[PDB]
Structure 1
Amino acid sequence: PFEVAIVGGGITGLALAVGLLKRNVSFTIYERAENFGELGVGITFTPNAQRAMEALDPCVLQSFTNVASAPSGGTINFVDGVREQGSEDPRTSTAALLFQLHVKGGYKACRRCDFVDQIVQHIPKDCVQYRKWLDSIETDHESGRAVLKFRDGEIAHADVVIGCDGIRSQVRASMFGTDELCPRAQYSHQLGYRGMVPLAQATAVLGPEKTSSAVLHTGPGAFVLTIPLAEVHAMHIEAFIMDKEEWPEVQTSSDSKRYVLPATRNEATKAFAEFGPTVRSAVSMFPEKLEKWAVFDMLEAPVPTFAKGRVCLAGDAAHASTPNQGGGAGFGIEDALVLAEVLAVLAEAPNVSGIVASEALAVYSEVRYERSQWLVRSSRRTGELCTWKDRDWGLAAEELSRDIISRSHQLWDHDTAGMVSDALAILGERV
């Protein structure tokens, strides 16, 4: 009977796991770490991701809502962060509004560790094998089933292998290799500086007009998001600075060590010196010492497909993205939903051949591949729009609004139900 191996207990892998559990599909999660750690990064999930969470199972969405914070007002105001008018005190200034982005079906943010902790409560402990660092995959000569080989020297068998193992996926290496020309994530030239302050502090400094909703402050070479989270009485400040430099290469198993460097507030101060009072004040609210996150994506070196034989990729393993149109983790949840649904059809059969397993994964890839590639490219472009890379969009508000509203519609307002039904229709025709 049909066994799914999930490699990696990140958001993608855990979401899939709950999906399979609720559909009575046999699986095991293989996780290299001793536990799921404590990475507390804020991830914003968009309406499409929330629908996918619910379709996986109500408890996946519940796990998220249990820990997520809604911003005070639900529209994102795009402003020109340079041409703020009226005063040098943000409390008395007028924001230079470009356009308002209304989200249909809500966005919320959570700490990654909080959501993981929630989802993990719905997965039996025996379904997770820790200290299982996937190193290679072979085919069983006798059975033709997949053979996972771990760094500890042990093996395991499965009918399908789902690489949910993140931006530096070993499953991806198994499928396509890891030479200099191989598919991989590379630096997107975007550096993130993040901080949380009391909402009362932000209001004191900026005035309640500027803390009453999310605001994305656009400008030359850099942008800031100020996101009021009234239910934890916090203001989240996120600054992204565009960096034409390459990112210093470090050889390390740790993504934190690979993608993060110490910084000072001065780097942000300098980056936003030509911006208006609101942005300068927001950046001033950072700690003096902080970290900078180098954002990597798979724009330049994508994978050619998400499936090959009995093996496939989901989440950051398949399509690590910039977060400029919401966290890529959300589209990992879409991936997990399609997989959960297709794998459940296979699990219902008494015997599943290698051929049929491979065809099923191919259907998953056909459904997700181009939409995923578009996420990576569109999110990159959104960052270029917000940092005025090729145009001063402060002078082209209506053109900017049409571009961002359209890209957001394509990404966020997707027919999640239709996606799954399409996958299953195609699967039914092909097997």
Structure 2
Amino acid sequence: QPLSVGIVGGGIIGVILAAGLVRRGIDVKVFEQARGFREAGMAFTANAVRCMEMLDPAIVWALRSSGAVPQAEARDYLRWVDGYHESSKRLYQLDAGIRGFEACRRDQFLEALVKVLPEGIVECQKRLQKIHEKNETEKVTLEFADGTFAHVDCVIGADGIRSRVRQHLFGEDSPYSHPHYSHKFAFRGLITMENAISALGEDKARTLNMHVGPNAHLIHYPVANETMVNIAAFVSDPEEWPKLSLVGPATREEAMGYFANWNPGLRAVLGFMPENIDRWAMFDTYDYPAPFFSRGKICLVGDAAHAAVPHHGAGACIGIEDALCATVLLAEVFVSTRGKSSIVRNRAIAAAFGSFNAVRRVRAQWFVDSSRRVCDLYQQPEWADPQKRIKAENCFEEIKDRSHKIWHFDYNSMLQEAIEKYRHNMGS
């Protein structure tokens, strides 16, 4: 027969993983708890877009048909600005090259992706409650909350930051089963490009900028074809977060209080927002990172494995690499065990998930820490004191090192290492 893979979670990574798997002949089901919803925006590095292409070129097509339509060709730049002093001097700039980042709306991209898939791959209102493992040779059983069941040769948790599949591995009372608070949260909202331009200038208004300063920072970029500018404003919170929901209503005047000393251009951007906005809490896996991404015939991927604070803007890139590593590994399982017994085929699954863990965990968990580390540098208290300016500006070399370690990932090597580890684990 073929090999069946139950993917729990119909987010970006689950659906991309699925698309890569069916394009290779693997039987896939995606179980998503929500009711065909996408209830925001995200960005991919050029490296991740090449990973997408290797999964299935239609994915990249979906990405670019969802987004927008932009004489020479523009290079993509991360830029940092002093947010605290009126100097508002441009501190640093990182060149990511042509189409170094490519952008979509999360909900439009997912919709396009599912159109690309065969029919009846995605099952909605399928909330996983329990996993029943048995022998390596038996199918794994998924139990859902509406009383239904599925049977699959192996299981992938693409079920996000609050992964149920993760709870199964470490235990519901283990801190390793849950995310925890980064003691930061963000205000988000939009403003008119005209308003934006009014406060920052046409040049700042039309590019992405991080404004640094003490214990907080703010980022903004143009959206909806340079008519609107999106604002995300991040602040510190010495208090624990109450089951209070991670997202919640807030007001512009609350956000303005945190930036009261900051420079006037920046305080304006804030004042031009709707009176009512969101407050998103930033949880992640930093405090209690997974001891393993895989056990037996169960593998975590994306935010289920390594959910990160969003301050490299690449968290979903790490998950796309995961998807590619898991797709290529399971393809090698399919082809190398094709004529063999049920025992070899199930051993090979476990051997592949063992290779996955071996090759992906260090980089994924490095990235989770890195995402906190760079937030710290964007929020150094010494951005306040102009006599500590050399110290504070010295951070950018490390930011650059970390950025390039993300963007320049050698995924061909990862795949090679993974195939080699798979074959080793099989006794070969």
Q: Tell me the TM-score normalized by structure 2.
A: 0.91
Structure-2 residue corresponding to 1:57 = 56
Q: Is the 8 A contact 2:180 2:283 kept in 1?
A: yes
Distance 1:183 1:202 in 2: 42
Query: Are residue 369 (structure 1) and residue 361 (structure 2) matched?
Result: yes
* Aligned positions of 1:398-413 closer than 5 A: 398-413=393-408
Query: Are residue 283 (structure 1) and residue 275 (structure 2) matched?
Result: no
Gap change, CA 1:419 and 1:143, over 3 Å in 2: closer
Gap change, CA 1:141 and 1:358, over 3 Å in 2: closer
Distance 1:381 1:62 in 2: 34
Query: Are residue 421 (structure 1) and residue 420 (structure 2) matched?
Result: no
Q: Is the 8 A contact 2:184 2:282 kept in 1?
A: yes
Query: Are residue 305 (structure 1) and residue 292 (structure 2) matched?
Result: yes
The gaps in structure 1 that reach 5 residues or longer are 86-94, 251-257
Q: After alignment, is 287-296 or 48-57 more displaced? A: 48-57
Instruction: Could you list the structure 1 runs, at least 4 aligned residues long, displaced by more than 6 angstroms after superposition.
Output: 70-73
Query: Are residue 133 (structure 1) and residue 127 (structure 2) matched?
Result: yes
Gap change, CA 1:295 and 1:142, over 3 Å in 2: closer
Q: Is the 8 A contact 2:31 2:126 kept in 1?
A: yes
Distance 2:68 2:302 in 1: 23
Q: How far did 1:389 drift?
A: 4.7
Gap change, CA 1:69 and 1:418, over 3 Å in 2: farther
Structure-1 residue corresponding to 2:169 = 175
Superposed CA deviations along residues 371-412 of structure 1, whole A, max 9, x for unmatched, are: 010111000111111111577675436512201101101112
Which one has more relative contact order, counting CA pairs under 8 Å at least 6 apart?
1
Distance 1:179 1:347 in 2: 36
Letter matched to residue 60 of structure 1? I
Superposed CA deviations along residues 289-347 of structure 1, whole A, max 9, x for unmatched, are: 11100010000011101000000100111011001001422211111111111111112
Distance 1:377 1:353 in 2: 36
Gap change, CA 1:99 and 1:232, over 3 Å in 2: closer
Query: Are residue 82 (structure 1) and residue 76 (structure 2) matched?
Result: no
Q: Is the 8 A contact 2:8 2:128 kept in 1?
A: yes
1:106 to 100, 103, 106: 100
Matched-pair identity in %: 38
Q: How far did 1:427 drift?
A: 2.0
* Aligned positions of 1:120-159 closer than 5 A: 120-140=114-134, 143-159=137-153
Q: Is the 8 A contact 1:139 1:147 kept in 2?
A: yes
Distance 2:181 2:89 in 1: 31
Superposed CA deviations along residues 16-60 of structure 1, whole A, max 9, x for unmatched, are: 01101111111111122221x133x22222333222212211111
Letter matched to residue 379 of structure 1? S
Secondary structure at the aligned position of 2:187 is classed as: strand
Distance 1:109 1:373 in 2: 24
Q: Is the 8 A contact 2:382 2:392 kept in 1?
A: no
Structure-1 residue corresponding to 2:328 = 341
Secondary structure at the aligned position of 2:183 is classed as: strand
Secondary structure at the aligned position of 1:304 is classed as: coil
Letter matched to residue 110 of structure 1? C
Distance 1:194 1:48 in 2: 28
Distance 2:280 2:316 in 1: 16
Distance 1:70 1:407 in 2: 30
Letter matched to residue 65 of structure 2? N
Q: After alignment, is 306-315 or 240-249 more displaced? A: 240-249
Gap change, CA 1:204 and 1:168, over 3 Å in 2: same
Distance 2:68 2:212 in 1: 24
Q: Is the 8 A contact 1:44 1:326 kept in 2?
A: yes
Superposed CA deviations along residues 227-253 of structure 1, whole A, max 9, x for unmatched, are: 124735321221111212111123xxx
How well do the aligned residues superpose, as a CA RMSD in angstroms?
2.1
Q: Is the 8 A contact 1:98 1:397 kept in 2?
A: no
* Aligned positions of 1:207-226 closer than 5 A: 207-226=201-220
Letter matched to residue 24 of structure 1? G
Q: How far did 1:111 drift?
A: 2.0
Query: Are residue 34 (structure 1) and residue 35 (structure 2) matched?
Result: yes
Q: Is the 8 A contact 2:333 2:345 kept in 1?
A: no
Letter matched to residue 263 of structure 1? A
Q: Tell me the TM-score normalized by structure 1.
A: 0.90
Letter matched to residue 184 of structure 2? Q
Q: Is the 8 A contact 2:13 2:320 kept in 1?
A: yes
Distance 1:116 1:389 in 2: 39
Q: Is the 8 A contact 2:62 2:112 kept in 1?
A: yes
| Aligned length in residues | 413
The gaps in structure 2 that reach 5 residues or longer are none
Secondary structure at the aligned position of 1:125 is classed as: coil
Letter matched to residue 102 of structure 1? D
Distance 1:389 1:425 in 2: 47
Letter matched to residue 420 of structure 2? A
Q: How far did 1:210 drift?
A: 1.9
Distance 1:181 1:199 in 2: 44
